[PDB]
Amino acid sequence: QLQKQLEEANDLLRTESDTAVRLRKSHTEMSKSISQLESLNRELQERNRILENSKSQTDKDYYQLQAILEAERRDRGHDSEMIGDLQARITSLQEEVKHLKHNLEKVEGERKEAQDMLNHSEKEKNNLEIDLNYKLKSLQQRLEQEVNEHKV
Amino acid sequence: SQLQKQLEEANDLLRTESDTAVRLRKSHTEMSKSISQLESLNRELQERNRILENSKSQTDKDYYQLQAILEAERRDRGHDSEMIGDLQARITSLQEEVKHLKHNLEKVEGERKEAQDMLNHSEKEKNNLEIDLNYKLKSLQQRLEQEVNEHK
């Protein structure tokens, strides 16, 4: 009868106030978890902020070494210009040497011919002087030998 | 009809209770959404970190490659500098060979000129001598033979 109807509402009202205790326990554990998670996510957010700046710093250091590389290259470039100009100057000097040598030779040849002509002129003139000297004296001797023939 | 009011309490409570059992079933589904979205953000945040750490690490590797390019290419500058010195030496030798040839050419051409002058003096001295004597001998000879003939 009703004794079986209240013995039911008994077991039911029990499990209800029972599972209400379990829900309250459920909810105090989820309060505790979401609070520890809010304090953890705060940490991961900060390690990330740090990572980011870290990576951005690594970038700057890379770029900075590139800038140094591109300056080196700019200098190695001036060395190649310089080497090029020394080589060109060398080439020019060499052909100048060649040319001057060839001129030396030629002028040296012309000096020789000149000296040959000079020598011949001097010898020819010398022969003349030697000849005239003896012959003129030979005239003066022949006249002397007549004068002195009758000197008493 | 007094206990009928007690069944108005119970009825009314089994509705306020059946109602907060539905506000819960909804609350819990709204929370299992948040938590699912947090899991999302969390996998995303973890992804960025991974990419960050990887991009950062590839940059470190590239940095060391870059440094190696600097060292390698800086050897080719030690050689460039040794060359510039050698070509600078080859150039001073040549500038001297030129200085010396230019000198020799000036002298050898001086010698030529002088030999040409001496030759012109020499020919002039001789031909003046020959001309003068020729004239003086003519008169002396004629007048002697004016007499050698007036003998007969």
Author numbering:
A (entry chain A): 542 to 693
B (entry chain B): 541 to 692
From the paper:
Among the downstream targets of activated Rho are two isoforms of Rho-associated kinase (ROCK), ROCK I/ROKβ/p160ROCK and ROCK II/ROKα/Rho kinase, which share 65% sequence identity and 95% sequence similarity at the amino acid level. ROCK is able to regulate the phosphorylation of myosin light chain (MLC) by direct phosphorylation and by inactivation of myosin phosphatase through the phosphorylation of its myosin-binding subunit (MBS). Interaction between GTP-Rho and the RBD disrupts ROCK I's autoinhibition and thus activates the kinase.
ROCK-CC displays 11 consecutive heptad repeats starting at Leu-589 and ending at Lys-666. Strikingly, near the center of the coiled-coil three consecutive d-a-d positions are occupied by charged residues. These residues (E613, R617 and D620) create an unusual bulge in the coiled-coil. Most interestingly, the charged head group of Arg-617 inserts into the center of the coiled-coil interface and together with Glu-613 and Asp-620, it appears to push apart the two helices. The coiled-coil is bent by about 14° in the region centered around E613/R617/D620, where the inter-helical distance is also at its maximum. It is tempting to speculate that the E613/R617/D620 irregularity destabilizes the coiled-coil, effectively creating a hinge that allows the coiled-coil to “jackknife”.
